Amino acid sequence: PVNPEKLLVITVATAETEGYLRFLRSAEFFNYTVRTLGLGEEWRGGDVARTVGGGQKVRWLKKEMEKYADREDMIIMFVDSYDVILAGSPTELLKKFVQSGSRLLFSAESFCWPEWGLAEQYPEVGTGKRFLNSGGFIGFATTIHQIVRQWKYKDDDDDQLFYTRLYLDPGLREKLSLNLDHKSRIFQNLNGALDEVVLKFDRNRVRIRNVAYDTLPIVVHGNGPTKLQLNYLGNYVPNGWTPEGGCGFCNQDRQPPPRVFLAVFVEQPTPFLPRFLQRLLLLDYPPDRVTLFLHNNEVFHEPHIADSWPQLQDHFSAVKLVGPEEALSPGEARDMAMDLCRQDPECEFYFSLDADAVLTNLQTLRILIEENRKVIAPMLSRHGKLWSNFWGALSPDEYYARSEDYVELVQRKRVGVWNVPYISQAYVIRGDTLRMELPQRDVFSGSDTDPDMAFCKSFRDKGIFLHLSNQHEFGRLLATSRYDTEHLHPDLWQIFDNPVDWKEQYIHENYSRALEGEGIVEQPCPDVYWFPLLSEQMCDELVAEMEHYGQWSGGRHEDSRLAGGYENVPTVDIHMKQVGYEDQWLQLLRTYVGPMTESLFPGYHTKARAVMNFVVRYRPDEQPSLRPHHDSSTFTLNVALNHKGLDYEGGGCRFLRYDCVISSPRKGWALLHPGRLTHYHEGLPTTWGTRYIMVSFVDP
Amino acid sequence: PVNPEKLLVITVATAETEGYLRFLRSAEFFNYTVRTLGLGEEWRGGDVARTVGGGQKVRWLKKEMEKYADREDMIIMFVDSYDVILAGSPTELLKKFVQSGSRLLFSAESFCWPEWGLAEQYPEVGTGKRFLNSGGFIGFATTIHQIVRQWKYKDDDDDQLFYTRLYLDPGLREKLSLNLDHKSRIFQNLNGALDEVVLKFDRNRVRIRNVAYDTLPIVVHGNGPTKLQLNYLGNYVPNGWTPEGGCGFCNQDRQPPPRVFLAVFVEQPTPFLPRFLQRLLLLDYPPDRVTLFLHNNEVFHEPHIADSWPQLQDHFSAVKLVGPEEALSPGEARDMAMDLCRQDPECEFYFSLDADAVLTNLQTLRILIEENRKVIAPMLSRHGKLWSNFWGALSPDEYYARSEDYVELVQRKRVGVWNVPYISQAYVIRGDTLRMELPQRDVFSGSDTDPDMAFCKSFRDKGIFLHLSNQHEFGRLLATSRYDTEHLHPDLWQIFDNPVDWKEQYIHENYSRALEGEGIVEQPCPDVYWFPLLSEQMCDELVAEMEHYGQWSGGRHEDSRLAGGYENVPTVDIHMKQVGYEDQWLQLLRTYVGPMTESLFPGYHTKARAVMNFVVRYRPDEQPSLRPHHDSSTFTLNVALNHKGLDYEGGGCRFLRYDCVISSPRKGWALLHPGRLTHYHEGLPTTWGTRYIMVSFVDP
Ligand SMILES: *[C@@H]1O[C@H](CO)[C@@H](O[C@@H]2O[C@H](CO)[C@@H](O)[C@H](O)[C@H]2NC(C)=O)[C@H](O)[C@H]1NC(C)=O
Ligand SMILES: *[C@@H]1O[C@H](CO)[C@@H](O[C@@H]2O[C@H](CO)[C@@H](O)[C@H](O)[C@H]2NC(C)=O)[C@H](O)[C@H]1NC(C)=O
């Protein structure tokens, strides 16, 4: 049994990047002893991401190995650091090294790189990997010194070619007992083997398994174009996220805060923008520490911004509006906003927030800052769907792809802080990072690629992780796809596409409490119920939309009311069909009035069918009253839309068989009474002003 | 001006017949002085109704005229009496006689009778009547004596031929100044002039006008086959019936009573016979003075007679039943019944009453006896129609005909006691008349003519008036036309043909009071009303009819009830359609339930449409309960059909939204509640016995 105190891990790292730090954490988890070569030095090994190079590693390792040239008691494993994680213990590692019978075991990979012609010189291996990879090897310090001491080439010469040629010397391969880990018992290179690697979960740690060879590798190497696949595995392996411990590096359970530049982007017509702008005043972060930048690209939203701007200017430290008249593209506005923070050394954090992001968690900005990441996004999802503001994987084209764990993350089956290839709509970036690692202005622009993808590609090219937290519930994403802007109040038509936000804006705030009991619902007349249904904003916008149409009913107009053996009881009104709001209003009936009626009339069942839905206008100068009649409905819904006293004087609804009068209606409240046989009723005359009501004859 | 004290009317009458008495009344009305010749003598003038004769009148007049052979101061008018009425005063009569310039004025008629060949010998008259009639003449006593003294022929020789031949002597016609009343200024003979005579009304008397000659005759002579037309006129002229005085011989405004033989005839299956038989016990006449004879021709009615007979035998003086097993024809039974009274000198009055005659006036028999007529019938009419138990006129065939005043009599625009040609269904005949004037047994039989017509013809042949009183409301006539006897209780199906009698038998006695207010209707649960609808007999017969059908509902049977989003709520029941009672039950709904629902739910209007009408049977051993549900109706009718306690133990109807229970239903009473939305309800389990209810889902 080889003593783990005799094992030393050597790696190379010119800077403490997130990948290197991820490597060290995995090393410390298993109590590995790591020696890092080359910190602070300038990397002269060339663009190893694009071509060959890396000889500076061999030079640095050769110098280091002269100390141990005679240390036959020492085992050394050289590995990369930026794209390597450790999945197994030193004890298991040494046990497997001894089992190999090798004196210097190199990792094996599928490709013969960089010289593909040398493939013939390699020994024939049946079913395992055949060729050498220089990203990881392990052997006796004496044997390794005899190999690396022969380095005498340029810092930008290829390291793997150097080891390959020495390994292809049959006499040297035999003299020193060199070997390759063909079946990935110790080293797992990802390039050319993605379909062979799966995560193997344990209670408080995660590994990988090679299903081709049925092994559990110690070293996971995201070599070549597999950095993002290694990013995925590194979210779990070895103690990233565990079934019983949860994530292993997030905050989990949570004097001046850092100054922040908040950039808000309005790049398309988006619903509920006044609500979004009002919410900015409610973000739980000291506003004197926040500078606001708002780019509005829509003339449709200029009135919305204008209404909010006095409150925003009075609220935040400083404000800046870039309107549609600047003719800025989205990529130019986002480059501008980010560079305003980049060129300001007092900007410690950049917070980018799009208009379709609804932050229900007012502590979002705090939470993300405490995570102490370079880049981090809150997970936002569209209500009741899988679509959200991040990607778990990339197609080969670098386009959208669904990761293996995407649904688990979106459904918050697994929560934590996740290294992901793409984020959007909301993210917090460290100002230091913009100054030191992404100093260019063309972050979102510069190519024909979509700006939000160029942004993410810009950071992946620099080795900057893009983090995503679902540790908390942060909010949701508005549907903006086909937002019909040709209305006086377009958000009235948003009941289908954005129902949660529609309910918060238009359904009465005390509606849901009334539906749960709690003694809000009243019964002013025997079988006539009274409950809050619409908010004041819904009433005001519906009335406005009606008057904007203008074409109220006149003579010859017929309604479905029964009085004295006749249906000749008309009202001056507009039907929802005329204004194209019937489908929308029928949805309100199914979702909100139906369940209320079944609660108040136990035993009755409804699907809220209604052919007759209309807004009535009473006025002393045209039609102020409505004579006694029955409704052609099983039950009738009657919603007030303005204020008695302020907007009109005059009575409301009289139920004759009960001598019971609703004399003081309440604005967003609805009456619910039977339509036939029992509740013969009358609309009392409006004597001053104008009285609006919304009526539906449901279940005719 | 000729003194009316010089005028003497002479007529002939061997018996004080109704026609003679009618003549004398008209004579006394105008203060005429009448000398009647031949009373008590045997009539030897032959059958003047069938052929020639009447010379006995001329012989009797000749003897009488010898007293006045020299009385030039005296004017004498000879007229018939049995078929003559006087329509004018002696003063007007003498004024017209003088105006004629005649010394002996004979009446004129259209026909030259009895020798038609003598027509050529008559003077030519332009447009008036040409030939002589011996039924009336007026002249000086000296001139008349010179004519009648030449009589020397047989008692059965023709009187009119005698006068005609003397009138056709041109020298004698000239010597004595004989004339004919060509234009009916004084005498109106009806034969051949019916289309010329109309009634002329005054305030307190009635005349006739000749529209051909525009005259007002003094004497109306129903000569030949016009006796019945004279009967019609005699109902008015001169003071029979007047617009301001009413009838002039009826009682108008009304110690042992006469003994009566009451003969009841059941010659066809007739509805409501048990009610008819029960009514016999309620006729307001001392039953110890009444003998009952009942002829039942229908085996269908034998059980009905059997049930009633103990009460009838105990009630009346004596009773006699002739059943179907005697095989008596209607004419034989009516001959038998009438002859039982005829051969019994203690029978002072005969009262014949048919089973389809409903006497609503329990004083009928008294009223008719007080009228002191030989024959008299109460006017009975079929409800809401003109058909009734008399004819006003006869066709030439002696068949049915509508008289000019028939509708006025049936509608009781004119009331009185009327001389009519035909009566039926109910009449009171003086026993003396049967003994002395109609002694034959074959009154209804003897020919192929219908028995009821033979009866009336028998009396008209004897000169017996058939009287009809509409002076009071006496009753009605049942429709018996198509009485469907193939039912367990056929009278249940009589709602159309006999609705007044159907209502009295089957509709609850206190229903109509409840419909007029009076605080019978109850409201045991909020909008659930409770009123009496059916009588106990209706409930018992409907249940019996249901059990007699027997085929109650079982598994797989579906009803129109809504519970928990489903229509799977069945009852063990029978639908009215299955037993062929739906049309009948829908008529009950329209007539009785509809108007009640409109009274209790002001504003609602109904035509009582119902596809779902059925009787439910609850039993502990099959289906004792009915789970909570809604009804597929605007409102629901729910009628109990038996007694809680006596017939079943267990609850009734529970309305869940009100915690209101109808725990003690009342038999013929009905519940009336809404069917939808508000009155979710349950049928509580029947724990002992059997519970029947009648349900209708009206206005679905
Ligand atoms: C919803 O209900 C709350 C509480 O029941 C209402 O709040 C009250 O508002 C009145 C004036 O409108 C105040 O006088 C009370 O003090 C408030 N009570 C509380 C507990 O805050 C609220 O107004 C209701 N919402 C709407 C739209 O009517
Ligand atoms: C119709 O109403 C009358 C009176 O309202 C009912 O007669 C009463 O009957 C009860 C017993 O049933 C007696 O105790 C009372 O004395 C009666 N009152 C009178 C004024 O006679 C009659 O029962 C009702 N008819 C039906 C079929 O229920």
Ligand SMILES: O=c1ccn([C@@H]2O[C@H](COP(=O)(O)OP(=O)(O)O)[C@@H](O)[C@H]2O)c(=O)[nH]1
């Ligand atoms: O600027 C650099 C680039 C490279 N490296 C080290 O050199 C190794 C080789 O780089 P890379 O993993 O990107 O090459 P690949 O494995 O894809 O061939 C990295 O893991 C780092 O340990 C470094 O220290 N500084």
Ligand SMILES: O=c1ccn([C@@H]2O[C@H](COP(=O)(O)OP(=O)(O)O)[C@@H](O)[C@H]2O)c(=O)[nH]1
């Ligand atoms: O039995 C009789 C029949 C006849 N008359 C009288 O004779 C008249 C002639 O009879 P009738 O009127 O029937 O003959 P007609 O007018 O039809 O020729 C009657 O009016 C009676 O006055 C009579 O006294 N006894």
Ligand SMILES: *[C@@H]1O[C@H](CO)[C@@H](O)[C@H](O)[C@H]1NC(C)=O
């Ligand atoms: C690592 O070493 C420390 C002693 O410094 C020990 O407490 C810890 O349990 C070790 N961890 C493992 C995984 O062996």
Ligand SMILES: *[C@@H]1O[C@H](CO)[C@@H](O)[C@H](O)[C@H]1NC(C)=O
């Ligand atoms: C008939 O005579 C009486 C006198 O006895 C007289 O009172 C009556 O008014 C007279 N009637 C007529 C109609 O002349």
Ligand SMILES: O=C(O)CCC(=O)C(=O)O
């Ligand atoms: O005026 C009211 O509140 C009642 C109006 C009404 O009942 C109707 O619209 O049919």
Ligand SMILES: O=C(O)CCC(=O)C(=O)O
């Ligand atoms: O049992 C009862 O009285 C109620 C029965 C009922 O409601 C029905 O027949 O539908």
Ligand SMILES: [Fe+2]
């Ligand atoms: Fe309308």
Ligand SMILES: [Fe+2]
């Ligand atoms: Fe209404």
Ligand SMILES: [Fe+2]
């Ligand atoms: Fe049924």
Ligand SMILES: [Fe+2]
């Ligand atoms: Fe029911």
Ligand SMILES: [Mn+2]
């Ligand atoms: Mn590498």
Ligand SMILES: [Mn+2]
């Ligand atoms: Mn005559």
